Amino acid sequence: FRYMPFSPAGTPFGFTDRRYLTMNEVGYVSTVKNSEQYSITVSFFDVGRFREYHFEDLFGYDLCFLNEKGTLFGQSKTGQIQYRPHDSIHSNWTKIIPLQAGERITSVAATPVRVIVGTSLGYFRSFNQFGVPFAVEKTSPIVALTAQNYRVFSVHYSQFHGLSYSLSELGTSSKRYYKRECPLPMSLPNINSDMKKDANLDYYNFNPMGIKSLFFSSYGDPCIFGSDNTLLLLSKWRSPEESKWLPILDSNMEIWKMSGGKETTDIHVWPLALAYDTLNCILVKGKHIWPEFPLPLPSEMEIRMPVFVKSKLLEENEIQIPVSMAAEEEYLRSKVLSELLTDTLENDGEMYGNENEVLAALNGAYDKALLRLFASACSDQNVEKALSLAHELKQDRALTAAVKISERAELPSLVKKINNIREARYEQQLK
Amino acid sequence: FRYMPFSPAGTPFGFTDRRYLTMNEVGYVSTVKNSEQYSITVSFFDVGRFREYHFEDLFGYDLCFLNEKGTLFGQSKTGQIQYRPHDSIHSNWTKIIPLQAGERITSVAATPVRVIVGTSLGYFRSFNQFGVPFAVEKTSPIVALTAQNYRVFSVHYSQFHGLSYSLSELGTSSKRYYKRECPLPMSLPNDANLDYYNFNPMGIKSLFFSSYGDPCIFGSDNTLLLLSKWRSPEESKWLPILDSNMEIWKMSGGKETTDIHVWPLALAYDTLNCILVKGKHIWPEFPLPLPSEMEIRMPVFVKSKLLEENEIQIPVSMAAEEEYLRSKVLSELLTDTLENDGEMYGNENEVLAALNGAYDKALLRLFASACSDQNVEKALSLAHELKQDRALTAAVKISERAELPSLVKKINNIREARYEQQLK
Amino acid sequence: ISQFSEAYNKILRNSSSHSSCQLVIFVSCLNIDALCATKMLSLLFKKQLVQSQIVPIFGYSELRRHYSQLDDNINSLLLVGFGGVIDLEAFLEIDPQEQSFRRDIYVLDAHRPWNLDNIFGSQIIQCFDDGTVDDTLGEQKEAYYKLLELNDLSKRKQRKKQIHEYEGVLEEYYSQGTTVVNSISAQIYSLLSAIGETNLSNLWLNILGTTSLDIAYAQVYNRLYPLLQDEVKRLTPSSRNSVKTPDTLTLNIQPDYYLFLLRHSSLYDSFYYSNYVNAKLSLWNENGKKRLHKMFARMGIPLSTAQETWLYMDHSIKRELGIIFDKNLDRYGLQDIIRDGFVRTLGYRGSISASEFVEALTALLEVGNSAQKLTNLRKRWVSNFWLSWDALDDRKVELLNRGIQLAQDLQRAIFNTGVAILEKKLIKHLRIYRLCVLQDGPDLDLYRNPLTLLRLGNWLIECCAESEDKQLLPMVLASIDENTDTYLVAGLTPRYPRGTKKPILNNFSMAFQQITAETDAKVRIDNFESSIIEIRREDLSPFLEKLTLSGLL
């Protein structure tokens, strides 16, 4: 199985002689080939802070990774790498990584204190910001890399194995592992016989794994977005035996609801950045799923839990969702977000300074959405289902509101059951 | 997939009627075919310690393993095994292992207190030194075995997933697992070469344990892998401290032949013992070759840069980077061995003092090159990697000669910070 | 009782000091196989770094004057094949002194009659009893075991008869003829394999001694036809030829003949010992000196290319005899010629097999040099023994051919008189045996040393190896060269024409005890081998009169 050079959010050439090297929340890096060489132009979204520049390439650097401090270039054939800092304090440096026959650089990464270079045979060579070489480590072949200023996240895959994930940190004294080669059940792309004449064959040839984009969240949670169009977020990463992947977004249901129940395929989702509530994307309209020259304006898309029926939405009728049906989806969305925000503040603390107002508003909407399902259970005379819903309340003021819904529904036995929960929580609080 | 009988450091038949059953630091066991039976001849390197002997093979054993107390034989077709101790005090014992339809014994192992027998269906049958059974375990199919003392190290390879390895210890209370089927980073291969591939489907030439407690493996990719920190799963990683291609190229003059391979024998703290085999076949035949020793080198070189600068010779400046990588790995492993297991020979302190002195000396060569190219910032990061207090004093004199007064004061801040932490 | 690895380690620690803790071995020179066993034992004692002392002894009466007079702190005496029949502990008194004794000999006896005291009741005689004979007279568990300790008038009377019942089974036993059942090559080579030392020189050495008994017995080495085969294959040095290596001493197998020393030389003097082979058929001179001239002078035998034609392209003719005697096989059927054999080479310097090689060692032991003449005769045979022991290096080349050219005249010497005593017709079948007395001929000097005499008998036992379907009894000869009629008379064995079913060892040594017990009127048994004694001139005629009536077969 021949490998391919992978980059974050990279697009292939297609039917043109120009393409994008990389793309992220900082900006985008594109190249223009005019019959003999490549012209790399790096443009940013924030014109005020940094200045747009360009240069001529004489080596053909196709691998790139962009962070807040510099730009790293790499060559998959000769093994020559180059790091270019944006500020004028540090000078440029050039070093050539020795590569054997067959072995090629598939993915590169750059942090401000460590340099990560990965190969097709799985050699892990790490360098610092000054160029001092460290110990050489031999592991599984790396096909995908992502980082946000401190850690190394590697994805492994071979011909006699399957997709996995590893989480490590390059400390000052030694390498410490949070997660060591745990299996990742991400679905592989199913190329059929009719795809050989399709116009989207060029995207899968440059990226056989189907990994469109992958990046870390604003609060430190690992995220991945494969070819199955489902956004996966890693929950409970501080505990290796308790780590779980939770799907909180799906593009396949959002396109059908916004288009009025149609079956078109000209609308897609390209992930750029996600800071705990909205995935930034570009609405690409056309046959190709990859962007080209000039980028449209970014839109906002809030996350939604993929829990719907298809036959029930047609009978009840932009497609609109009723009150009663949306209470189940609001309960699932708020429960996942409140648990992750609580563990982040008790272990890492504040990051922006306004986390307490977000947590108070999220916990208030969590108890309010549960009361809508609680009112529906009392109307259908199901006293037993209403008892289990009362135990999921967090705030003490939510238990008082549950009594008033029960008295209005003429259920005196349900009223006394709420008071037993109140006496049990006060006893445990005094221990 | 076909389950072939594997043996440690074994060679196939080829176009001859004789081959090597096993090969290690103790000696080598070979077999000679005659008109009606087989003939097992066991020869040793240390003739003055043990008595050389031989016997006729009536049953036709094809599996063998050698340790410091005896010799174990095994038959893959009938399941009959036989253990023969070198001393005349202990009596021989024969027992038949039950085998199902299509089941063949693929790998055996022996320790002086426990007997390890592995099959193609994954049956784990363990015996003691007298033949009394203790437990029957159902695990993944074992294709390769190696053992020093208590430890059992098995390489697993199933039909669909495959390529994994396990590490365990046969303690007095219960069998403890340090690793539970972790993936192996060994590279699989993509006439002498054709015949060797059929008998050895995974390309594993040899495998053994080091003298300092670390498991070593030598696959088909000719890269010596070193498993460091096996007692802790948080920091357990493989370290390729030796690259075959680089060592042959530098010593020969700057060329690269094909017929000169490196067969591994043993590793005892300074060099890798080997046999220089010259010819078309990759397996040795019968002459008596002299044992050689190759100095350990980190595989960090460029190919185009060595041709421009010209046995191929490496310059001073380029060798300082390779010397820094080699000394850093060896000093960390020797420090953890002495603080947990203690001394083994009695001269570990002189080796550690000489290694730490060469580590700080090699870093100063890269430190001098950074000052010559006016890179003050790169020189600051190199000063933090020094261990000895006398190395910090020598860094001041290199900085004053290079006319950098700001770099001099930065070395003194590191000295004051280490003295404060030492008094806490 | 002596496991083979045990005595070696036990004799190691008893004398391994760097002083005069000298262990000393003894060997007879009167046997070829006695030599080659000892040579391989010495060299491993060199590379096990121990001090030693080697003394030959040719005479059985000499043993007192070589041991029992010169001893200081020798704890470890060693001996090769001397006392299977006569008990040395009765021959030499050793009082029990210091159960965990102070000086312990071993023994490496190769003979069939044993001595019960030397295995049972062992306190200084640590004999080699391992898996040699598992049936060491297995009925003996009550005969001497009740001889050791020996109303009762009717009870002890029966008990004396049980002793007398034990007496007869010790009377028929200790009354058997002797051979060597198993060569001393077989034992010590098996011992070294239990230690495990791989050298082809050893494998070249051990096969020499068993090759020597090819002319004394038949089925002893017929058991060793596998044990020659497995070792040359298990100690395979090479699969290829790997040519033009002057070293490495390659071992192979090639066919070979009773017609001997051919690869060394002389298809010329084969003409004599082709007629030896026709002396095995029906003649000694008559028809053959016509009959040989169908099969031989077919090619005139050259001077220069005969270094090449009967060295190399006689392989066209060995093939031709190979395609002559295949059509002399269903018709002639005389199978004394084709033989499997064994060979070795030196890289260069010609191919030399082991058939002819034992022949040079016999003749070179022979020639190559009151009571005042026997001393100056006995000092010769020890000395000329000594120049044969160093024949096993590469360093002897131009002395190796010296015995070779010596051998192909000695047979021409011995056949010169054998044809005389036939034509004299002085062989007389009296009643039991045939008697011949070589009273005087020419060249009587080559009959003092007894190693020629068994060969003369070996030629003479085969003149009477026709059908002879009654009276298969060998002869007794007589000759004299020196004063007082010493007369080294000897006996032979009867022979089989490749058909041993009957147990024919010897009857004479039983009678040799009788005549020696009668009058002691100048009879001597001072020579070592019991098949040779001496007699006086006026005693040989009453010798036979005592023998023609004493039928002890």
Q: CA dist B138 to B5, B120, B130, B142, C395, Å?
A: 19, 11, 23, 11, 66
Other CB atoms within 10 A of residue A118 CB: 25
Residues of A in contact with B303 (CB under 8 A): 98
Of A269, A266, A256, A264, the closest CA to residue A298 belongs to A269
Q: Measured between alpha carbons, how far is B253 from A43 in angstroms, rounded to an integer?
A: 50
Neighbours of chain C (3+ CB pairs under 8 A): B
Spatial neighbors of A412 by CB under 8 A, at least 6 apart, are none
Angstrom distances, CA of residue A35 to CA of A38, A56, A292, A353, B422: 9, 13, 19, 52, 63
Residue C455: φ, ψ to 5°:
-70, -40
Same domain as C330, residue C369: no
A121–chain B Cβ distance below 8 A for any pair: yes
Say how far apart CA B117 and CA B107 lie, in whole Å.
7
Where helices occur in C235-282 by DSSP H, the ranges are 270-279
Are A175 and B237 a contacting pair at CB < 8 A?
Answer: yes
- For A283-350, give the DSSP string: ---SS-SS--SS----EEEE-------SHHHHHT------HHHHHHHHHHHHHHHHHHHHHHHTTT--
Q: Which of B162, B182, B225 sits opposite A160 (nearest CB)?
A: B162
Phi, psi (rounded to 5 degrees) for A279: -85, 120
- Identify the sign of the CA torsion C351, C352, C356, C361: positive
Cβ-defined contact of C233 to B39 (cutoff 8 Å) = yes
C5, C196, C239: residue with CB nearest B54: C196
C66, HSE (Cβ side, Cα atoms, 13 Å):
18
Chain B residues near residue C239 by CB distance under 8 angstroms: 16-18, 285
Tell me, yes or no, if B240 comes closer than 8 A to chain A by beta carbon: yes
Same domain, yes or no: C9 and C113 = yes
**B296 part of contact set with chain A, CB < 8 Å:** no
The answer to whether position C479 is within a domain reads yes
Burial class of residue A1, CB neighbours in 10 A (0-12, 13-18, 19+): exposed
Alpha helices (H) in C108-244, listed in sequence order? 116-119, 144-147, 152-172, 184-195, 200-212, 219-222, 225-234
Q: Report CB contact under 8 Å: B298, A136.
A: yes
Chains C and A share 3 or more Cβ pairs within 8 Å: no
CB atoms within 10 A of CB B324: 22
Closest Cα to residue C205, out of C5, C315, C410, C358?
Answer: C358
Closest CA to C311 of C301, C323, C298, C297: C301
Burial class from Cβ neighbours inside 10 Å (0-12, 13-18, 19+) for residue C388 reads buried
Collapsing DSSP to helix, strand or coil, A123 comes out as strand
CA distances from C40 to B31, C35, C43, C206, C225 (A): 26, 9, 6, 8, 22
CB contact under 8 A, C196 and B286: no
Q: How many domains does one find in chain C?
A: 3
Give phi and psi for A22, each to the nearest 5: -150, 170
Judgement on whether residues C547 and C403 belong to the same structural domain of the protein:
yes
**Cβ B54–C230 below 8 Å, yes or no?**
no
Residues of B with CB under 8 A from a CB of C: 16-18, 32, 34-35, 39, 41-43, 51-54, 56, 88, 285-286
- The count of residues in chain C is 553
Report how far residue C300's alpha carbon sits from residue A82's, in angstroms, rounded to the nearest whole number: 93
Q: Do B54 and C193 touch (CB under 8 A)?
A: yes
Asked if A139 and B328 come within 8 Å (Cβ–Cβ), the reply is no
Element (H, E) at A223: strand A222-225
Picking from A96, A130, A138, the nearest residue to B240 by CB comes out as A138
d(CA C114, CA C136): 9
What tokens appear for A112 in the block? 């401000």
The type of residue at C427 is: I
User: What is the experimental method?
Assistant: cryo-EM
Judge whether C247 lies within some domain.
no
Name the residue type at position A296: P
Residue of C nearest to B42 (CA): C196
CA B385, B389, B394, B400 torsion-angle sign: positive
Q: Partners of B169 in the beta sheet?
A: B151, B176
Could B237 and A137 be called an inter-chain contact, meaning their C-beta atoms sit closer than 8 Å?
yes
- Strand arrangement, sheet containing B142-146: B142-146, B151-156, B164-170, B175-183
Contact criterion met (CB below 8 Å) for B74 and B58: no
Which residues are CB-contacts of B286 (< 8 A; sequence separation ≥ 6)?
Answer: B18, C236, C237, C238
The Cα A404–Cα A394 span in angstroms is 18
Helix/strand/coil for C406:
helix
Q: How far apart are CA A223 and CA A274, in angstroms?
A: 9
CA-nearest of A218, A235, A336, A221 to A280 is A218
Residue A407: φ, ψ to 5°? -75, -30
Kindly state whether residues C28 and C164 are assigned to the same domain.
yes
DSSP code at position A212: -
- Directed axis angle between helix A355-379 and helix A323-345, to 10°? 140
For strands C434-435 and C475-477, give the pairing: parallel
- Judging contacts by C-beta atoms under 8 Å, the chain A residues touching residue B163 are 160-161
At a CB cut-off of 8 Å and minimum separation 6, what does C504 contact?
C177, C493, C494
C160 and C95 part of one domain? yes
User: Does the CB of A77 have a partner CB in chain B at under 8 Å?
Assistant: no
Helix count (H) and strand count (E) of chain C? 21, 12
Considering the domain boundaries, does residue C347 fall inside one? no
**Choosing among C239, C248, C253, C340, which should be mutated to test the B contact, i.e. which has the most B CBs within 10 A?**
C239
Structure-token pair, residue C110 = 């190769």
C461 and C313, same domain (yes or no) = no
Provide, as residue numbers in chain A, all residues whose Cβ is less than 8 Å from the Cβ of B325.
133-136
Nearest to A12 by CA among A211, A206, A282, A209: A206
Residue burial B332-370, b: 16+ Cβ < 10 Å; e: rest:
bbbebbeeeeeeeeeebeeebeebbeebbebbbbbbbbb
Q: Clarify whether residues C329 and C357 are in a common domain.
A: no
CB nearest A140 (choices: B183, B299, B302) = B183
**Which chain B residue is nearest to residue A89, measuring alpha carbons?**
B377
Enclosing H/E stretch for C7: helix C4-14
Are C516 and C525 in contact by the 8 Å Cβ rule? The answer is yes
Answer whether B52 sits within 8 Å of C198, measured CB to CB.
Answer: yes
Residue C248, in any domain of the structure: no
Q: Is B299 on the interface with A (CB under 8 A)?
A: yes
Last residue of a domain, one of C334, C361, C391: C334
Contact C542, C550 (CB under 8 A): no
Among C5, C195, C230, select the one facing B88 at the smallest CB separation.
C5
Q: Residue C540: left (phi > 0), alpha (psi -120 to 50), or beta?
A: alpha
In whole angstroms, give the CA distance from residue A391 to residue B298: 62
Scan residues 343-402 of B and list those with Cβ closer than 8 Å to A.
366, 370, 375, 377-378, 380-382, 385
DSSP reduced 3-state for C432: coil
C344 domain residue, yes or no:
no
CA distance to partner chain B, nearest, from residue C489 (Å): 48
Strand B175-183, strand B80-85: pairing: unpaired
Residue of A nearest to B235 (CA): A176
Cβ pair B33, B18 in contact under 8 A: yes
Q: Is C251 within the bounds of a domain? A: no
Q: Do chains B and C touch (3 or more CB pairs under 8 A)?
A: yes
Domain span at C187: 1-237
Chain A residues touching B360 at Cβ < 8 A: none
B251 lies within 8 A of chain A by CB: no
- For chain C, which residues lie within 8 Å of any Cβ of chain B, measuring from their own Cβ? 3, 5, 193-198, 229-230, 233-239
| C-beta atoms of B381 and A129 within 8 A | yes
- Residue A45 gets which letter from DSSP? S
Rounded distance between C-alpha atoms, residue A254 and residue A257, angstroms: 5
Distances (CA, A) of C290 to A258, C281, C344: 126, 15, 36
Inform me whether the C-beta atom of residue B307 falls under 8 Å from chain A C-beta atoms. Answer: no
The answer to whether A103 faces chain B, any CB pair under 8 Å, is: no
On whether residue C119 sits in a domain, the answer given is: yes
Contacts of C234 in chain B (CB under 8 A): 32, 34, 39, 41, 54
Distance (Å, whole) CA C472 – CA C494 = 6
B223, B235, B302: residue with CB nearest A96: B302
Asked if residues A213 and A224 have their Cβ atoms less than 8 Å apart, the reply is no
Which alpha helices (DSSP H) does C244-314 contain, by range?
A: 270-279, 288-295, 306-309
Cβ proximity of A40 and A31 under 8 Å: yes
CB < 8 Å & 24+ apart, contacts of C13-19: C14/C75, C14/C76, C14/C104, C15/C50, C15/C75, C15/C76, C16/C50, C18/C51
Around Cβ C105, how many Cβ atoms within 10 Å?
19
Task: Identify whether residues C146 and C213 lie together within a single domain.
Answer: yes
Q: Count Cβ atoms below 10 Å from residue A356 Cβ, excluding itself.
A: 10
Q: A128 contacts in B (CB within 8 Å)?
A: 381
> C198 and B43: CB-CB below 8 Å?
yes
User: Across the interface, do B17 and C229 touch by the CB < 8 Å criterion?
Assistant: no
C-alpha C263 chain-centroid distance: 25
Chains meeting A at 3+ CB pairs closer than 8 A?
B
Residue of B nearest to A120 (CA): B187
**CA–CA dist A8, A299 (Å, integer):** 21
Strand-pair partners of B333: none
Q: How many interface pairs between B and C have CB atoms less than 8 angstroms apart? A: 43
* Euclidean distance between CA atoms A136 and A143, whole angstroms: 18
Say if C243 falls within a structural domain: no
Q: Name the CA radius of gyration of chain B, rounded.
A: 26
Backbone angles phi, psi at A183, to 5 degrees: -70, 135
User: CB within 8 A of A380, min separation 6: which ones?
Assistant: none
Report the DSSP pairing between strands C105-107 and C125-127.
parallel
What residue in B sits closest to A80 (Cα-Cα)?
B302
DSSP secondary structure letter of residue C434: E
